[PDB]
């Protein structure tokens, strides 16, 4: 009947593609070939209609040597299994004897430059350099201790039997090879005659090897002191830089993602996404925004605005009346948009440039917010660290570096502001700038290296915003529309003012038609304000 | 509350040399023990000398030809065994060195002695950081492991325990241990491991077991850059349900420390506190427990992690400042117990976690 | 590049005292002939060259051997079979190669600078573009699927030809005991059969009837 | 000019794609199968005096399976197999042990490899005919004789031994 025809038209519409519809008709034809059961028919249908509940329900109502796993596979039945002499009843009854897996890779593979920073391979190299001394020196010390014990033993009975005393392969120790290894290393090629000598006549051989080993271990210990002094000045130059795995990439990715074309494409992609969904006819209302952002402080807004003012006030390229325009704009109207001067919203129809600047402003606020949270978190962890460590019995419950005081940790944030301001002046080279930033804010400092570039880009946006007539037009249209009370207001009064809002929409279209138009919405809740922006 | 515990240390286990540039570097145990000693932990914990395991104990699982090869092989007679060396995967990856058979002897002896004492009910917790080598097979050496100590420990424990749980938290997959108990209902192998172009290349979602031991072998593939809280949120539920349904009598943990941040061959990003969260979680269920060693290649971090989880086993807390030790200069430049994680991107996105966890839950619901 | 390795090893020194095979076209351990640049594997010789067999000195290829020895020298089917055996003796141990008649037969990524391409193509399960996560395009149909959107989700990149989960051949791959060729013929049975709209729709309303005829 | 070849695709997949090896002493060695063909075909014609050529060509298949094996008949995964065969039972019949599936590879090669030996027209015609009916008898009872179910696999030791 026509219900089936409607189902097929709508499945064609929601599949958007001929080949997948071919696959679907393949499945149903295979089922018609009676090679597929109804439950099986549905287990092959579900990949097609696993996200449209209505169509899936409609279709359901309409109807009314082996190998396992991925790596385990069989041994030959007539395979001579390796015999074992310790097999008990459990060994036969529990152990596998039919299934085998294969190691697909090998350890220590090509991983040197896969995901590791250049400052970590250095630490790995120093680690190996340290270990080889540690092992050789400690083998020598262990051999010294063992032969010392055997000598302390030997010096205690009558001399008529000392020539009868002998030493075994272990050199008197618990390990057969450790002492022999040490002697080989000490003596080069002439070691084994001496090994025979201390095995045959220990009484005349123990003191001489003991003396030579003593001198050698003191020489190696002094060399170790020198080497360990040299080894320092190296962990300090790599540890913090090794913990950061994103900075080198992040510089380029942020300096590339802040271009205007990227900011445009990020929302055009969402527009085309929702357009394709709308063509599909899927269950989604035609009022849901495209991009949502959030500010969770007002003081951070004042800080960011202060920073932008601080940059622009020291420029040569913009004149004093434009400085006044910029001050008026940033410190009065943008707070006006945010209602800094629940369920209260403000609307704003903006051109391309306004979208650009105001997204950059959101990014700056978010960066500063992450910095603030990390500083506060550091303070709390350090305070609770003193609290926990002060009351601690250590084992009774049966040099170094000076950490900053709480005052400095609390002073971190304004100091960071002074530092970024200074970087904007440029009197502080970015190199020790980033060194200082990292040394304060550990692994979370990766976000704040490119703040200067962002601030200068925002300043260019502001200069263009004042210079271009379309922006000023947009702003005074917003002003008179707020005077009428049409633009923005109470959530309840949305149904009352939808008509005047729609007229405002019409004005925005007729004003900026040859360019992409944006809608921006500022809704306030529990002290935080949520950006919502969408395209038109 | 506080309970008795045992520790087996043979002072020579650190002296063996795998070869120049070999990431398997057995020094780690020696610094672990020294750090424990200078933390004053030995007053509350008993330290024992492990008896060297006889080859008869090793043949209980391994092929006699393999053990003969292991005992007869030396660096000086490489020529006279090349055919067998190729036949037994001994070479570049797993090399022959001085006293390798002694090292394997000690490694297996520690854990087997722990298992004997555990079976006797003389203690409910024993530690052996030398053992836990899990990549060794029935008749081959792989993944820097020669004699699969854990399987011998489990075979010893089964003499008195009806059901036992094996937990692997190494970045690698315990391929040998699971393959040994692939087809049995007496053991579950719960492995959390990174998958994808990674050694050994086994350990999918659906490697779920076989025969009577079907549904009795759960794996958890992960991606790069797993972090602390993600691991915590995924561990406690899976473990709580596994030991609610299975109700085992003994538990064995492989604390592979190669899952830490900044490892030489690892990609994970766990911290020492996050790593010890697992041992607190498993112990809180109050069952007899065996802790074994395994991986761990960033030697300072390995020492830190093993020391901390040992101290957790005693229910003892230790100052974040490291006390003085013979290898103090390794922990520069901060010289602190806990390590700060790196900041690389976590590819283990939350919905992936939710889906894998749900599939595991469904698979476990089938256990009788 | 100041490495400490050389000095430390010299300080601990004991005293002591004073590109591809020509036969199989694949790499590995190769021996290169000293008259021609061609190289052969240790098992690419007639008879195979074992480790203990190689003579001390220069190595010669089989083709160079034949050339050198030729220069130095300068209805019964029994005769055809002798011809065949002589020819087989002359042949080189390269490989057995299947006939080509049987063995034979970008846009969804960020730009070079990094940017979402336009127009966009979206994950089938979410209708979301490449921005959220990398997109995997099926090699049989132009369907793109996410990493975490399948069931069960993949952990790692499928290095080979991925098989999308919408396609039907999964029910054919379920069997673990049948031969490859049967599976291949079943696959190819659906790889050409298209444009059957009327017959499948008719069968569907045929089966739809609640009361069988 | 070969028929019902898709069995070769299965052989290729199990040998060098599924990494599943063949049984060394599986059953029905190639010379034994050739003797079975000779016995079966002798009871076809009422008076096959041409048995003097039938047996000769069967033995020719034997001799060509003698020296050609190993050179350009096996796959790169099959080098260790041939090495073990040559090192374990060299004095034993080398044209034995190896099962039927390796036989078809010889004929697959020979169809192109013959293009370097200029035989006379009648002889090549007869050889073509005998290849044809040999292969049609093989296609007749392939399911009975060819069996991919009993195909063991290679543990990683054989993987190291191969490459
Ligand atoms: Ca694991
Ligand atoms: Ca099991
Ligand atoms: Zn070759
Ligand atoms: Zn040559
Ligand atoms: Zn998706
Ligand atoms: Zn597909």
Residue numbers in the entry:
A (entry chain A): 304 to 367, 394 to 670, 737 to 793, 802 to 939
B (entry chain B): 8 to 375
C (entry chain C): 17 to 34, 57 to 112, 204 to 234, 257 to 364
D (entry chain D): 200 to 362
Please give the exact wording used by the authors of the publication that reports this structure:
Histone deacetylase complexes remove histone acetylation, thereby repressing transcription and regulating the transcriptional output of each gene. Remarkably, SIN3B encircles the deacetylase and contacts its allosteric basic patch thereby stimulating catalysis. A SIN3B loop inserts into the catalytic tunnel, rearranges to accommodate the acetyl-lysine moiety, and stabilises the substrate for specific deacetylation, which is guided by a substrate receptor subunit.
In conclusion, SIN3B, HDAC, PHF12 and MORF4L1 interact with a 1:1:1:1 stoichiometry to form a V-shaped complex where the SIN3BCTD and substrate recognition module form two arms at the top, the SIN3BHID at the bottom, the HDAC is in the centre, and the SIN3BPAH3 connects the two arms in such a way that the HDAC is completely encircled by the SIN3B subunits. Strikingly, PHF12PHD1 recognises a composite interface formed by the MORF4L1 MRG domain interacting with the PHF12SID1 as also supported by our XL-MS data. The MRG:SID1:PHD1 ternary assembly form the histone recognition module (or substrate receptor) of SIN3B. Within this structure the PHF12PHD1 is located on top of the active site of the HDAC, suggesting that this domain could recruit the histone tail substrate to the enzyme. In conclusion, our data suggests that PHF12PHD1 and not PHF12PHD2 can deliver the histone H3 substrate to the HDAC active site.
